[PDB]
């Protein structure tokens, strides 16, 4: 129920580009490859342009395009995410890390011609100089996480929460709360949803052809309605 | 896939019937898969297209083929309610007993998404 989800129907070019500065360590990724919404399915490939990565690449899959996420018939009215496209959306959140530093991201997301690119600028402070992300103490893999979503009448968007769980190699796990905020850049209408939640999947791999500091990415994302016995 | 196996991967979700069959007679890998490991009869499962579904299986397509995420072509025709899909996939072997990482079965996918065609015959 929106021209903007017409723009996703076959396989779609993604672009990701992020500025970085994180307790003054400077760094650039940059990000490309594909997406396939009615599968749910991303697979992408990311390079730090500017050297070694100061931060594990986990640390930074939440921020570097909820658009692709798989919203069944029955719930096509629920997808902001498309709605908004393709003049776009704004994603801002804040990322806690437990015991530890916070992630401030600013993200446009929008298509440029037939490419869908997400443009970031990510501010990182407060981090212990040996704690688990300074210090590269995640493990190189992910966890599957429910998002949870809720219109704001207010602003024409959308607010979401969830916590990521990080993997750390003695056993134990660092949660990263994130609470999260969508904007549409156009003036055009968008779809407000009932509450609802995506049900993510990743896996993280390297490129054996790749030199540079890296992460390839493979994503599967689903949304799905509450059901009787959540809450 | 290969190159031929990508080809066939591409035009198969791209509906392209006619390009697949050409692909298929000469020599496309049908179990090709991509780095999720979706082959051929998934995507084409997901997006309901019947003719390169039966094209697929005649050339020996595994029906009961697992992504990554465990999702079979059966998961993927029940994800968008493909009833004469479903109906050839169980004709040639589909598992309706196969899970996904989510325990979910198709049956309990027509569950989800409220279909009471589908429902019937997935049990």
Same mark, same amino acid.
């Given at each position: ?49 500017? #050297? ?12 570097? =395009? ?10 096509? %009215? ?8 393709? &003049? ?12 530890? #530093? ?10 440029? #011609? ?32 429910? =998002? ?24 134990? =796990? ?5 609470? %999260? ?6 003036? #055009? ?29 493979? &994503? ?12 | ?51 390169? /579904?039966? /094209? ?31 109906? /050839? ?6 598992? /309706? ?27």
């Amino acid at each position: 129920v929106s021209k903007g989800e017409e723009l996703f129907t076959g396989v779609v070019p993604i672009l990701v580009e992020l500025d970085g500065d994180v307790n003054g360590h400077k760094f650039s990724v940059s990000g490309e490859g594909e997406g396939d919404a009615t599968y749910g399915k991303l697979t992408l490939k990311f390079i730090c342009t500017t #050297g070694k990565l100061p931060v594990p690449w986990p640390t930074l899959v939440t921020t570097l =395009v909820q658009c692709f996420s798989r919203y069944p018939d029955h719930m096509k %009215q629920h997808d902001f995410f498309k709605s908004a496209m393709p &003049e776009g959306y704004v994603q801002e959140r804040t990322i806690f890390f437990k015991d530890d #530093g916070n992630y401030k991201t600013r993200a446009e997301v929008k298509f440029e #011609g037939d490419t869908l690119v997400n443009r970031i600028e990510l501010k990182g402070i407060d981090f212990k100089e040996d704690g688990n992300i300074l210090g590269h103490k995640l493990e190189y893999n992910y966890n599957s996480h429910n =998002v949870y979503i809720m219109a704001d009448k207010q602003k024409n968007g959308i607010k979401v929460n969830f916590k990521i769980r990080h993997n750390i190699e003695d056993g134990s =796990v660092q949660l990263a709360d994130h609470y %999260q905020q969508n904007t549409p850049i156009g003036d #055009g209408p968008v779809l407000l949803p009932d509450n609802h939640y995506l049900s993510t999947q990743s896996a993280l791999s390297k490129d054996p052809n790749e030199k540079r500091d890296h992460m390839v990415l493979l &994503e599967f994302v689903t949304a799905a309605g509450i059901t009787l016995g959540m809450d | 896939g290969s190159d031929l196996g990508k080809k066939l991967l591409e035009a198969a979700r791209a509906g392209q019937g006619d390009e697949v069959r050409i692909l298929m007679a000469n020599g496309a890998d049908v179990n090709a898969e991509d780095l999720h490991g979706s082959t051929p009869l998934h995507l084409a499962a997901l997006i309901g297209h019947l003719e390169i /579904v039966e /094209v697929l299986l005649k050339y020996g397509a595994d029906v009961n083929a697992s992504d990554m995420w465990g999702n079979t072509p059966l998961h993927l025709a029940a994800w968008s309610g493909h009833l004469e899909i479903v109906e /050839v996939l169980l004709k040639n072997g589909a598992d /309706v007993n196969a899970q996904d990482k989510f325990g979910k079965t198709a049956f309990d996918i027509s569950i989800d998404n409220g279909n009471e065609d589908l429902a019937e015959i997935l049990q």
